[PDB]
């Protein structure tokens, strides 16, 4: 399906990262949307990603008792690069 | 499961009920004690309406209820659909065709296997009749004799336009579905529908 985009809370460990993914859900009864946040152990060979990074999160085989997810380069995001002003 | 009790009696309290009795009530002779309940609670008016219906067709309550559920289901005006359903009963059609004296009579007639609907014997009163249907007497001496005498000796020619009757073999024919104006009684179905809001 669609992969999950998030930001990194912890880089400290080797070949891994700890991502936080925020999603909104329409709470079952009261029809307002809510932010629920979940954390993941993402496998990141090469340790390219630092803390604060905004990374896309992908699915693969189990690497550990926790990490199922491949850390993957940010998928599509709006350029924080300045644009013309006509 | 049938009302075998005193009839005249129910008639005094309800109103005029064709499917029950042809004998017009006694003067009523209650003019001595002059006993009334005062007037009737709105509830009692509703109740007496339903009872009118129920005893005219010889239906039990638990049955009437299920007719009413079938009614609320049906897409259409509820009281009307109900009155349709009640008026399509085999025994009642057997009655309104003059093939019977009254509804307990017609009912008995059906029970004893004296009637045919499209060349097949139906012995149950509540069999629902559908358009283009043949109402015949079984070909035996008894069946024919019954139908003949009760048909001929009763003069009423009121046949309500959806009902055909044909002379020697005595083929009755159900032509179509009842019209609200052709209904078999004076009843505001509105009151009955209302009574049944709580089921």
């Amino acid at each position: 399906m669609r992969s999950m985009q998030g930001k990194v809370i912890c880089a400290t460990n080797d070949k891994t990262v700890n991502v936080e993914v925020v999603r909104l859900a329409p709470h079952p009864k009261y029809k307002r949307r809510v932010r629920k946040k979940k954390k993941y152990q993402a496998h990141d060979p090469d340790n390219q990603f630092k803390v604060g990074d905004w990374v896309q999160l992908d699915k693969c085989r189990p690497i550990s008792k926790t990490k199922t997810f491949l850390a993957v380069a940010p998928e599509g995001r709006q350029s924080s690069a300045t644009r013309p002003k006509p | 499961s049938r009302y075998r009790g005193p009839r005249f009696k129910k008639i005094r309290r309800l109103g005029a009920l064709p499917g029950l009795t042809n004998k017009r009530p006694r003067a009523g002779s209650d003019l001595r004690n002059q006993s009334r309940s005062g007037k009737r609670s709105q509830y009692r008016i509703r109740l007496e309406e339903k009872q009118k219906l129920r005893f005219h067709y010889g239906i039990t309550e638990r049955q009437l209820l299920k007719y009413v559920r079938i009614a609320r289901k049906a897409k259409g005006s509820t009281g009307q659909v109900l009155l349709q359903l009640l008026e399509m009963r085999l025994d009642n059609i057997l009655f309104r065709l003059g093939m019977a004296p009254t509804i307990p009579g017609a009912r008995q007639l059906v029970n004893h296997r004296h009637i045919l609907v499209n060349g097949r014997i139906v012995d149950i009163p509540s069999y629902r009749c559908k358009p283009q249907d043949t109402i015949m007497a079984r070909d035996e001496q008894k069946s024919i004799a019954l139908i003949q005498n009760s048909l001929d000796l009763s003069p009423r020619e009121e046949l309500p336009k959806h009902l055909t009757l044909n002379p020697f073999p005595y083929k009755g024919l159900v032509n179509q579905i009842i019209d609200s104006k052709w209904v078999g009684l004076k009843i505001n179905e509105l009151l009955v529908v209302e009574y049944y809001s709580r089921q």
Binding site: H27, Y30, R32, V34 | -
Partner: protein, 122 residues
């Protein structure tokens, strides 16, 4: 009131509390009478009411009302109790079904007989 506050689970129901805890989700229970005696009703209803104490199978001891007119019940009799409340007598939440087990039917009652456990007269 505030949406954000309801989303913290601010609406919780009050559960249904039974009027007859001693039965434990049953139509009847059987018990043995520990005692059979009279009590006076809360004023202004004056009379003498026939109540027994019954020790049940579910282990409880309760005080059950005995209906009708007169009775044969005495201690170490095995009766059948059912629910329902006598608004007169404080604490009495249970009746005793007549005509079953050790309670006989009321003698000579002609009307509403099924409520008292009496045969039809021939």
């Amino acid at each position: 009131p505030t949406i954000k506050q309801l989303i913290r689970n601010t609406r919780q129901p009050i559960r249904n509390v039974t009027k007859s805890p001693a039965l434990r989700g049953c139509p009847q229970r059987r018990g043995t009478c520990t005692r059979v005696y009279t009590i006076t009703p809360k004023k202004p209803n004056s009379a003498l009411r026939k109540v027994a104490r019954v020790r049940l199978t579910s282990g409880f001891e309760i005080t059950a009302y005995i209906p009708g007119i007169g009775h044969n019940l005495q201690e170490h009799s095995v009766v059948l109790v059912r629910g329902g409340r006598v608004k007169d007598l404080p604490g009495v939440r249970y009746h005793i079904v007549r005509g079953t087990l050790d309670a006989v039917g009321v003698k000579d009652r002609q009307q509403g007989r099924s409520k008292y456990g009496v045969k039809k007269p021939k």
